[PDB]
Design an enzyme around this catalytic site. Sequence first.
Site, mmCIF file in Angstrom:
data_model
loop_
_atom_site.group_PDB
_atom_site.id
_atom_site.type_symbol
_atom_site.label_atom_id
_atom_site.label_comp_id
_atom_site.label_asym_id
_atom_site.label_seq_id
_atom_site.Cartn_x
_atom_site.Cartn_y
_atom_site.Cartn_z
ATOM 1 N N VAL A 156 0.848 -1.214 0.000
ATOM 2 C CA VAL A 156 0.000 0.000 0.000
ATOM 3 C C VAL A 156 0.873 1.249 0.000
ATOM 4 O O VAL A 156 0.415 2.308 0.420
ATOM 5 C CB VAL A 156 -1.031 0.105 1.153
ATOM 6 C CG1 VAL A 156 -2.041 -1.023 1.105
ATOM 7 C CG2 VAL A 156 -0.340 0.185 2.479
ATOM 8 N N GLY A 157 2.125 1.092 -0.462
ATOM 9 C CA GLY A 157 3.068 2.195 -0.642
ATOM 10 C C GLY A 157 4.434 2.069 0.031
ATOM 11 O O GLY A 157 4.556 1.532 1.125
ATOM 12 N N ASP A 214 1.660 8.994 12.809
ATOM 13 C CA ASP A 214 2.904 9.826 12.572
ATOM 14 C C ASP A 214 3.269 10.935 13.525
ATOM 15 O O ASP A 214 4.007 11.851 13.131
ATOM 16 C CB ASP A 214 2.975 10.407 11.148
ATOM 17 C CG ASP A 214 3.527 9.421 10.130
ATOM 18 O OD1 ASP A 214 4.731 9.020 10.206
ATOM 19 O OD2 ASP A 214 2.726 9.060 9.233
HETATM 20 C C1 LIG Z 1 2.301 0.407 9.726
HETATM 21 C C2 LIG Z 1 2.536 1.690 10.502
HETATM 22 C C3 LIG Z 1 3.553 1.766 11.470
HETATM 23 C C4 LIG Z 1 3.770 2.934 12.208
HETATM 24 C C5 LIG Z 1 3.016 4.098 11.945
HETATM 25 C C6 LIG Z 1 3.186 5.456 12.663
HETATM 26 O O1 LIG Z 1 2.230 6.211 12.734
HETATM 27 N N1 LIG Z 1 4.387 5.760 13.191
HETATM 28 C C7 LIG Z 1 4.671 7.009 13.888
HETATM 29 C C8 LIG Z 1 3.779 7.248 15.065
HETATM 30 C C9 LIG Z 1 5.236 6.871 15.293
HETATM 31 C C10 LIG Z 1 2.034 4.009 10.968
HETATM 32 C C11 LIG Z 1 1.751 2.817 10.264
HETATM 33 C C12 LIG Z 1 0.717 2.978 9.322
HETATM 34 C C13 LIG Z 1 1.095 3.324 8.015
HETATM 35 C C14 LIG Z 1 0.125 3.549 7.048
HETATM 36 N N2 LIG Z 1 -1.266 3.378 7.444
HETATM 37 C C15 LIG Z 1 -2.523 3.550 6.746
HETATM 38 C C16 LIG Z 1 -2.707 4.002 5.244
HETATM 39 C C17 LIG Z 1 -2.059 3.001 4.299
HETATM 40 C C18 LIG Z 1 -4.163 4.162 4.917
HETATM 41 C C19 LIG Z 1 -2.096 5.442 5.064
HETATM 42 N N3 LIG Z 1 -3.500 3.334 7.664
HETATM 43 N N4 LIG Z 1 -2.986 3.036 8.789
HETATM 44 C C20 LIG Z 1 -1.633 3.086 8.756
HETATM 45 C C21 LIG Z 1 -0.642 2.878 9.704
#
Ligand SMILES: Cc1ccc(C(=O)NC2CC2)cc1-c1ccn2c(C(C)(C)C)nnc2c1
Length: 349
Positions: free
Chosen positions: A27-28, A165
């Site tokens: 998913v990217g 994030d």
């Molecule tokens: C796997 C993951 C690990 C850490 C962090 C994170 O947030 N790290 C920082 C806080 C320390 C975010 C994700 C994550 C990445 C993309 N996602 C999506 C999309 C694909 C719908 C965007 N929906 N939920 C997510 C969640």
Amino acid sequence: ERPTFYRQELNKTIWEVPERYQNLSPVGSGAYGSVCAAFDTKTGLRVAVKKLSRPFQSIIHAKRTYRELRLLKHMKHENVIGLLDVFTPARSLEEFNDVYLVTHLMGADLNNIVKCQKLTDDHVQFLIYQILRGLKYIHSADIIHRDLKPSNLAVNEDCELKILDFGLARHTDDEMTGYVATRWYRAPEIMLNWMHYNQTVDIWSVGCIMAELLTGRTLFPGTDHIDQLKLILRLVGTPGAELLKKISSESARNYIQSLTQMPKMNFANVFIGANPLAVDLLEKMLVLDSDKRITAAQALAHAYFAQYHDPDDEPVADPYDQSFESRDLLIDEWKSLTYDEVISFVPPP
Ligand SMILES: Cc1ccc(C(=O)NC2CC2)cc1-c1ccn2c(C(C)(C)C)nnc2c1
């Protein structure tokens, strides 16, 4: 009872993940790490798996891996992404070189759902209620998101939301340049480095997000930092003596003092037709002086969120120890700290 791992080629890179995770599909990528969606056969959840990523190639990358894992292990709130799992295929610290983080996957991000599209007032109350509820919790741990924007708000089909994030915010000079959503939601003091800033940088971004949900348009789509500042100052007014003083950057105070003074506009004439309670709360979030902006906790108590507010169901965080932020360590030290964190991980109930 180390699980059984299996190998897949994805992103044109090897994923080696426990057999519990099935049906991985991209998913990217990002620079950052690659994310895959997956079915967790152990929890019945759809999950997001992020492989870092050269995690220990510099001191900057090592500290960052440690930071992200620490942030994720801390967060335990419905409206904040936390860790479901962390793992490495490695069997020792000596072999340790890859970290995969596993997280709920809500479904989409807010940006992809809502953009160009105006929401109903009840839909706006709900989404912003949840953003401030999860921000109250994050801020109570002394963590600042710094980069809140619709793309890091994970939303599912029932408009339920987790924030992504927080605490990382490390964008390049170039990702912030020109006509880009990467800058449209940032607080002026942070965009233009006016001062060392508080947690209410994040309440400015909620205000920008909220106004966009209400109207269907970006509130400050500046074509550059200065154009965006002018959009800002045109709505909220130029600073007064009192804020000018607190702008510790001498350079930035001199620039802003060059500007023709403008008064704050009337928000009911900008947000025409909107719930007066929505407009009132926007005026409290979009205050230029960060010392005077409403906090997540005060905002949740605002009349706009009468249907959702439950003071007994808006929890706070245990405290977060970021003393590590001001520590300089070597690669192998960040890496060993990270490993300890990987191996003491206890899954949630
Ligand atoms: C796997 C993951 C690990 C850490 C962090 C994170 O947030 N790290 C920082 C806080 C320390 C975010 C994700 C994550 C990445 C993309 N996602 C999506 C999309 C694909 C719908 C965007 N929906 N939920 C997510 C969640």
